[PDB]
Structures are given as structure tokens and as C-alpha cells.
Write a protein that binds this ligand. Structure first.
Ligand SMILES: Cc1cc2nc3c(=O)[nH]c(=O)nc-3n(C[C@H](O)[C@H](O)[C@H](O)COP(=O)(O)OP(=O)(O)OC[C@H]3O[C@@H](n4cnc5c(N)ncnc54)[C@H](O)[C@@H]3O)c2cc1C
Ligand SMILES: Cc1cc2nc3c(=O)[nH]c(=O)nc-3n(C[C@H](O)[C@H](O)[C@H](O)COP(=O)(O)OP(=O)(O)OC[C@H]3O[C@@H](n4cnc5c(N)ncnc54)[C@H](O)[C@@H]3O)c2cc1C
Ligand SMILES: [K+]
Lengths: 524, 517
């Protein structure tokens, strides 16, 4: 028996409890699992929006039904990230300014795939018509019925729970953690130790043999998962793995966050995350029943904590002194290696980018999934460790590049922040994709239809997502896809798809309940 | 109007007529298409086995139904490539020698997809049991019902045309070409010019403007497709694009081929291609109704034409002097760039490897598909041309590496040929895949494509078939007793499906005889 017998998980945030719950299922009770978390060292407390594979790839693997976890964490529905004032200069406002060309400064990044005609995605037929003056429709409204549904604040499900569109989730991060702790302890025999780690004990090769707690107790193990957060107490401190800082790709390094009570009866509930541009970064809005989570993300090199806090307060008309604020400074980048010896980093201890496209919790279940697949025995085959590390580095660097694109192609130059973005160098892979887009070619054409996690993880950002961000920001191909000049029957087939999107939007904008009404049913 | 108005295709083999037919459909009669071919300069004449995406990716785009084209080219069913005598030393025989362990030296590469349990393919559950002494079944027999069906020479369809398994096609290459000529001329307004090209006319920028024919005809065009074959009359000669020779990856560079009449009533028809190992390469067998195509592929550095011809003749017991033989010397590698200025190479003019896994016709429809997607206007955007060239180079290098693996992991050391294979440099991508396999991890896990066409199941078929095993089972299996048990049901389902189907299916012979009237 050369097997791992005990797994010790340091940290009890979303990362630790997601790791405990998942490994509990994957390892089928052949391994002891221990979570060491100090209740006195708080979880980061933010991490409130997600992507659509969360239910398929995570809660379904654990056999937890969507309605059960949503009810426990005051969850709401997310059909997109909505970008506001990313093209026009001035102070932060929740209200979109007007472009030179008369359009409102909003674009959507919704989920689910573009239809295609003659093997060409709808994006490319839209771009031809728009470059040729045959349409003044935005990419988002022409190519996704989700846009019309979001504009009307309608739910992605009917009241009897049949599905209308693709969606993701908004939720309370701390309640998701608590719900997962309860699951892991009562249903998967996970041992919960509430104490502080004071020592990391190693053998002659620098492999971890145990953690000591403040109370003197020693937890032995064969595999340690560092979910300690930004501190990286195992991967960075004990194991001395360097963190590769990547503020030369993205500038934000700070956030100030609160929860804002909300008249849902008056305003309705937005089924989307808003990314509201600011002078020195942007501000998230994550609606739930009764309130929305908000946070101004910023570079402390271009705003002081006090400056960011005031602009954030002004945005929502908050009193800066009778308002509770959570202040965070964050690393941007990844460990040189996520997994060193018998230490695997997961969550903020591994890697991080601004929450601009809700990538954090996805990084956690992607890592856990890859750990389950690459799960070692005590020989720790170096090839297993290398393949795991390679998956983590490509997943991160892909998403980092996609995020950089959101900033580098903002036309805003009104503040030193917005100008500073244009001074940063693009990575090669994102330059290559821009040149592809600019020639009218598709970028990362999606592989399957909606339907299987591994079948999405490869290249997570598809053609539709590049179009949402490039075209949303006003970067267009130089010319239409030249093949369209030879394909009049395919132009016409695409006109039926544009009409199908309009009809589905109009029909569903009429029949669907408000997000408010679906939430009110869901939460009793 | 900046558009291409006339496309001229040089060559009337499978490449030219596939190009004409496909572009005919893709370009929706916005473009004049001309095929210039000399009846007096023959087709390569071979190119008789395929892979399963042929119907999806080609005949379906043309709206031609499977039965219609099969009937016109004497087509038969291919459920695998069957490797014979690739592990044991000696002369070429069609009969499998006996391995050290007592079983026959045969393994299959079938197209059936592997089921999985707890997101792990059946390959890995097989490998665990085999490395731990818990099974004596080979990978192919344990993991695919297709193996039992092929051993019984049964068809991959019932007589009522319901599908049993995945499969590809065998066919007469010249009849496929003729059927496609007829389609292109009568249904897609393609002009067929029967003449020999003598000059390629270029403008001051080195772009082609027209081809001049022996009879003094000038064919003007905006875009030229070189389907001239190994000659590469446009891409290599006129356009001066260098061919990157890759005999440092694969040694074979020659073939001697014939067609052999066959008693189908007596022997039945094998629903597979056979790759029969020889002293200085291998010999294909491609069955159809009434005959099989065969050819000994070889390195001329390790056998003379006469040596290869004798061994090939001995194999089938042919009289070397009252037997018609097609002798070919072939390029191995690709053009530095497949598309230069307004010249696009397709087929043997583009790139080539030995027909070990029936990759030739796939290179044609993959290229044509990519040309339709990257179709230029007269500005010939440099980025469109570069992205096309990149897709061709990844498609080719993927398949080249997969082929190299068939040779580098043969245990045979009995001839200088088989030893010389161990001396060749492995490409980085195939070294990386071997290291992945050896750690028990999957290689290119399937999804439900042209640049990772060869999946986990195909790597297992070749590695495990040749006797290369992972070092140890996938370690995660040691923690998953419920998944081991779920996999036992799938092994039992393969056995049961094989037994059931081996009983209910018609013979390949009988399905062919129904199909061809
Ligand atoms: C501003 C911000 C916004 C974000 N927004 C999103 C979003 O919208 N969507 C999204 O998907 N992700 C988001 N993320 C990322 C997401 O929040 C994280 O991936 C997720 O919250 C998990 O964090 P964690 O568990 O790794 O770390 P933490 O929550 O910091 O957990 C650290 C744990 O380690 C324990 N610990 C520390 N030291 C010791 C010790 N010595 N002994 C014992 N225990 C110890 C603590 O007690 C705690 O339990 C955001 C992150 C930030 C910073
Ligand atoms: C030994 C061997 C085995 C193969 N086996 C397989 C297989 O099993 N499966 C598979 O999928 N593929 C296979 N292939 C590849 C496959 O045969 C080819 O991709 C395809 O069938 C034919 O290629 P082609 O049409 O480019 O060239 P060719 O058939 O050589 O055609 C060349 C054309 O150019 C014309 N031409 C040349 N010069 C002139 C001129 N000056 N004027 C006018 N016309 C001219 C000729 O008339 C002819 O029409 C094999 C290839 C070889 C060599
Ligand atoms: K290469």
C-alpha cells in the first residue's frame, strides 16, 4: 500500500470546503480528509459571481440540487457581465453615458453559444452588416436574445422552473462556505479542526509530514492542500515557491467592498453582474434578494484607499462614515508552480486576477478537478505533478490575457489609470488572437454544443466572448470575413437566425417572470 | 468587386476533383471553376482507404448520400487498421506469427469510441488490470466490440441499414475521381479542360495570371490550386516554395502496388485494412467486392526496387513477370508554406506521409475545408494566408508524429530497417505524449478536431498493441473502488454486445452484395 492515507487541507474559505467536499466524493472514503481553519482568521468574504459550469462540474458531482444550495446562500441569477462607461470619460456613475455615435455606453458578455450558418458563427454575419452600414444593432443585441431579456430584468427560468436561457449564479460567499462545511462534515466524514497552524514539519527531501496547531496538536498527512489564501503559508512560506507578480499585465491590486440594501419591489432585480467603470478602475454590482454586493476594484498606484472609498461611496450615494467597508489588497499573478512536492495550492494561495469575469471560484473547481485526475501515490510521480502544473498555468494565462484585452482596447484616456493600461505590453497569444479577429477570422471557435466539463476547460473563452469584448469596446475587424462575399445563400440563412433571436427575445420578454418574482418564489 | 472571379485547378486526380466539387458548393456559383488535367499524365492511382469523418466533412457538404457514391466506386467498409507481424522477426507473411506469450502477433486500431466510468476511459481500467496480472485480454478485445465483429468478418450495419458501430471506407481511387468529375461538370458548372500545361504565366509581383496548354489555350485566373501531385508544378516549380523533406522522421519513401482478384464467396470480405509487416517496411491490404488493393511500402535506402517487388510477390504468391505493378517514389514532408501568393497546394503537391493510417484523402478535404474558410479576395490578406498555412502544418505534424510512434516502439531489431527506426529523432510533441502515457495519464482525451485528430483510444491501440505499457496504472484508480466496479460492468457490456452483434449482423460480403445491386 503506497497510497495517500491522509489529506490535510489548510484553510476553511470557499477553497478549503470546495476541496474537502470534492475530494470526499472523488476518493470514495479510501482517504482521511482533515480541514484545519482558524475561525479567528477570517475568509476573504468576497467571491460572489460565477460562470455557468458551476452546477454541472461541482454541485452535480456531489449530488446537491441547484435549489438546495441557492436557498442556503441567498443566491440569484446571472445571464452576463454588463460593461458600463468603459468607452466614455468621467467620474463613476451607475448610469451609462452616450458615445459620439449616439449609442449608450453599455455592452453585455452573455453565456451560451452563437448559432452558425454554413459553419460561420452569427458574429461574422453581424460584423459584415455593421461594417457595410446594413445594421446599427450592437453585437450583443443582434446575436443573443439574452440581451433583450436582461434589458427587461426577466429571469432565465419560468415560475414552474423550465429553463429559457443559459445562466450562472450570484451568492453570499460565506454562506456557500458554511453550507459546504456542513455537507463535508455530516455527509463525507471530513474532520474539522478549528485552530491556527503555527508550524509546518518537513522530512529530509522538504516534503511536508504534518502541521502543528496553536493548541499543540500535530496533524500528520501524506498530501497537503494550501487553501490559506494570499498568505500561501505552505506553497510560498514553508515550501519557498516564488509567486510570479503580473502587475505588468493588469494594474488593479486593491478593492473596497460593502453590501447595499436595495428596494427590489421598486427597481426590480438585474439578472446580471454590472462592471461600472471608474477613474482608477471599476466597481462590481452583484444583485441578490434584498441587497447587492458592490466593490470598487482599483490600482493603489493611481488612487489612495481614501480616494477610492469616496468615489465608491459617491457612486451609490453612501455616507462614508456610517457605512461598513471590507478593504483588500491582492496579489495578481500565479505561483511559478501550483504543486511543489506534496503541497498543492488551490484558491488565492495559487493564483488570482481581478474579478472582472468571475474567474476565482472557477480556478478552484478547475484545480480540484485536475488534482482528482492527477491524484498521486506516495512516489509523487514528477510527470503527474508537471501535467497538473501545466494545466493550471495555461488556464490562468489564458484568462489573464482575456482580462488584459478588456483594458488595452478601452479607448478611455481621461485619467492616468486609463492611459497607463495602454503602456503595458500584450502577451504574444493575445496579440495573435487580435490579428486573427482583425482579419475577420474566428478566435477559438467553440467545439461541442451546450453539452461534460473537460469539453469546456481547454479554451474556456470562445469566439463569442472575444466578439463581446472587442466589439463591445469598439474594436472591429478591418473588413468582413472575405468568404462571405461568395456566399449569398449563407447571408440569407443568417437573416433567419437574426429573426429567430428577435422572436425569442420578444416572446420571452412577454412570457417570463421578473427576476424579483422568480427569486421571491425560490426563497419561500 | 475585389473578389476572385476565376479559380483554375491544375490536376484531375482525387485532389483536383474533390477541390472542384467542394469549391463548387462553397462558392455558390459566384466564381468560375476550371480543372486542367492531361489524360496522358496518369493519376497516382492508389489512395483507397479513409477515416470516418469523410462522409460528415465531404459528401454531406455536397449533399451526396453515403449509398450513392459507394455504389459508383465499388466501396467497402473499414472498421480498423489491423497490424500483423509488427512485433515478431522474419520474412513477410499474411499469416500472423506467434508472440513470446503464445498469442497471435495481431492488434487492431478500430474507430469505435471508448466508453468511460467516473470520467476515465475504459483504456485505463484495462491497463490497471493488465499491469496487476488481473487480466490476460489484449486492449483491443477487452475494450471494443468492433474486435469481435472484425474477427467474424461481420458488417458495421444490419441489412435494414441500422448502424452497429463507427466505420470508414475502402474504394477504387480512379472511380471516386471519375464520379466526382461527373458531379462537378453536370451539377456545379465546372469546366473540364483535357490538355497538358506547358507554361505558368506570372505578373511583376510573382502572382500567377494564367496557365498555357500544349494546344495554345490560355486559362486566366485570380487563384490557382496546385493538384499536380509530387511534381508541384505551381507551388514548388513556378512559385519556388521549398519542400521540407522529413525522412529524418519516417524512412519509407517508395511503394510497389497491384490489385489482386479474390474469392469473396470462399474467404468472405474483411471489414478492415491490414498492415502486414515486411523486412524493409510493410504491405497494405484494402478489400473491396471481387478484389483487394495491395502495396508494399518500403525505404529504398534498405531495399532495392527488385528486392521489394520479389518480397511483395512472394507475400501473395504472385508471378513477378505476368503481374502488373505500379511503382511510386514519394516525398515525405510538407511545403514550407502550402499557400504562397495566389497558389494553394492541395494533395500530394502539398504534403504526404506513408499511407499507414489512411491520412491522404483526409489531408485533401481538411485543406479544401480550410481554403473555403480562409477564401481570399484579390488583396490576398497576409493573415488569411498565414492562418491557412498554420492549420496545414499542425494537421500534418500531428499525423506525422502519430505515424512515427508506430515505428519507434516496434520491438523488431531483425533487419537494418527495423533497427534504423530506433535511430530517428522523435518530435517533441510525441516525446511529451509518450511521457504522458507512461505516467498512466490519457493522451488527447476526446470531446463528444483536424489539429488533434488522434485521441487517447488510438494512442492506446498503437502503444499497447506494440507492447509499450504505462509504468503503473493511473494512480487515482487505487482510490476509486466503486469506479473499478462500474468499469467491470462496461467490460461485460463489450463482451455481450460483441456476442449479440456477431450473431445478428450480416457478413461484410452479404451487406456489400445487397449494396451493389
Ligand atoms: C476583491 C475580490 C473579489 C472577488 N470576486 C470574486 C467573484 O466575484 N467571483 C469569483 O468566482 N471569485 C471571486 N474572487 C475570488 C474568490 O473570492 C476566491 O477564489 C474564494 O473566495 C476563495 O478564497 P480562499 O478560500 O482561497 O481564501 P480565504 O477566503 O482567504 O481563506 C483563507 C483561509 O485560511 C485560513 N487560515 C489562514 N491562515 C491560517 C493559519 N495560520 N491557520 C489556520 N487557518 C489559517 C483562514 O482562517 C481561512 O479559512 C474574488 C476575490 C477578491 C480578492
Ligand atoms: C502509395 C500511396 C498510397 C496511398 N494510400 C492512400 C490511402 O490508402 N488512403 C488515402 O486516403 N490516401 C492515400 N494516398 C494519398 C492519396 O492517393 C492522394 O491524396 C490522392 O488520391 C491523389 O493525389 P493527387 O490527386 O494530389 O495527385 P495525382 O493523383 O498524382 O494527380 C496529379 C494530376 O496532375 C495532372 N498533371 C500533372 N502535371 C500536369 C500538366 N503539366 N498538365 C496537366 N495536368 C497535369 C495529372 O494529369 C493528374 O491529373 C496514398 C498515396 C500513395 C503515394
Ligand atoms: K514542424
Amino acid at each position: 500500500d503506497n497510497r495517500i492515507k491522509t489529506v490535510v487541507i489548510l484553510g476553511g474559505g470557499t477553497a478549503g470546503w470546495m476541496t474537502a467536499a470534492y475530494l470526499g466524493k472523488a476518493l470514495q472514503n479510501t482517504v482521511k480528509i482533515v480541514v484545519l481553519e482558524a475561525p479567528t482568521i477570517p475568509r476573504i468574504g468576497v467571491g460572489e459571481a460565477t460562470v455557468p459550469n458551476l452546477q454541472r462540474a461541482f454541485f452535480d458531482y456531489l449530488g446537491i440540487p441547484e435549489e438546495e444550495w441557492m436557498r442556503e446562500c441567498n443566491a440569484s441569477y446571472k445571464m452576463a457581465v454588463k460593461f458600463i462607461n468603459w468607452r466614455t470619460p468621467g467620474e463613476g456613475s451607475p448610469d451609462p453615458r452616450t458615445l459620439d455615435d449616439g449609442h449608450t455606453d453599455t455592452f453585455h458578455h452573455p453565456f451560451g453559444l452563437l448559432p452558425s450558418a454554413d459553419q460561420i458563427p452569427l458574429s461574422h454575419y453581424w460584423a459584415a452588416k455593421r461594417l457595410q452600414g446594413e445594421t446599427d444593432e450592437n453585437f450583443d443585441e443582434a446575436c443573443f436574445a439574452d440581451t433583450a431579456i436582461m434589458n427587461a430584468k426577466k429571469a432565465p427560468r419560468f415560475l414552474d422552473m423550465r429553463r429559457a436561457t443559459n445562466y450562472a449564479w450570484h451568492f453570499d460567499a460565506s454562506k456557500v462556505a458554511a453550507f459546504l462545511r456542513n455537507f463535508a462534515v455530516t455527509k463525507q466524514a471530513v474532520e474539522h479542526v478549528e485552530d491556527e497552524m503555527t508550524e509546518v514539519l518537513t522530512d529530509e527531501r522538504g516534503f511536508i509530514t504534518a502541521l502543528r496547531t496553536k493548541s499543540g496538536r500535530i496533524l500528520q498527512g501524506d498530501l497537503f492542500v494550501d487553501c490559506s489564501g494570499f498568505r500561501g503559508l505552505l506553497i510560498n512560506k514553508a515550501m519557498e515557491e516564488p509567486f510570479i507578480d503580473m502587475s505588468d499585465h493588469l494594474l488593479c491590486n486593491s478593492a473596497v467592498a460593502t453590501a447595499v440594501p436595495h428596494d427590489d419591489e421598486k427597481n426590480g432585480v438585474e439578472p446580471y453582474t454590472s462592471s461600472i467603470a471608474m477613474e482608477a478602475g471599476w466597481t462590481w454590482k452583484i444583485p441578490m434578494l434584498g441587497r447587492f454586493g458592490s466593490g470598487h476594484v482599483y490600482s493603489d498606484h493611481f488612487a489612495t484607499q481614501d480616494e477610492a472609498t469616496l468615489a465608491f461611496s459617491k457612486l451609490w450615494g453612501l455616507d462614508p462614515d456610517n457605512t461598513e467597508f471590507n478593504h483588500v489588497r491582492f496579489r495578481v499573478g500565479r505561483n511559478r508552480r501550483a504543486w511543489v512536492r506534496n503541497c498543492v495550492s488551490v484558491g488565492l494561495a495559487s493564483c488570482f486576477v481581478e474579478p472582472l469575469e468571475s474567474s476565482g471560484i472557477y480556478f478552484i473547481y478547475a484545480a480540484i478537478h485536475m488534482l482528482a485526475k492527477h491524484f498521486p501515490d506516495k512516489t509523487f510521480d514528477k510527470v503527474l505533478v508537471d501535467r497538473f502544473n501545466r494545466e493550471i498555468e495555461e488556464m490562468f494565462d489564458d484568462t489573464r490575457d482575456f482580462l488584459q484585452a478588456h483594458y488595452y482596447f478601452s479607448p478611455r484616456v481621461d485619467t492616468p489609470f486609463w492611459r497607463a493600461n495602454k503602456e503595458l505590453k500584450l502577451a504574444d497569444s493575445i496579440k495573435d488572437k487580435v490579428e486573427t479577429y482583425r482579419a475577420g477570422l474566428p478566435v477559438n471557435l467553440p467545439v461541442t454544443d451546450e453539452g461534460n466539463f473537460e469539453a469546456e476547460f481547454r479554451n474556456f473563452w470562445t469566439n463569442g466572448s472575444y466578439y463581446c469584448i472587442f466589439a463591445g469596446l469598439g474594436l472591429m475587424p478591418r473588413n468582413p470575413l472575405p468568404a462571405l462575399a461568395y456566399k449569398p445563400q449563407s447571408i440569407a440563412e443568417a437573416e433567419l437566425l437574426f429573426a429567430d433571436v428577435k422572436r425569442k427575445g420578444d416572446t420571452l420578454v412577454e412570457s417570463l417572470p421578473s427576476t424579483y418574482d422568480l427569486l421571491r418564489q425560490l426563497h419561500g
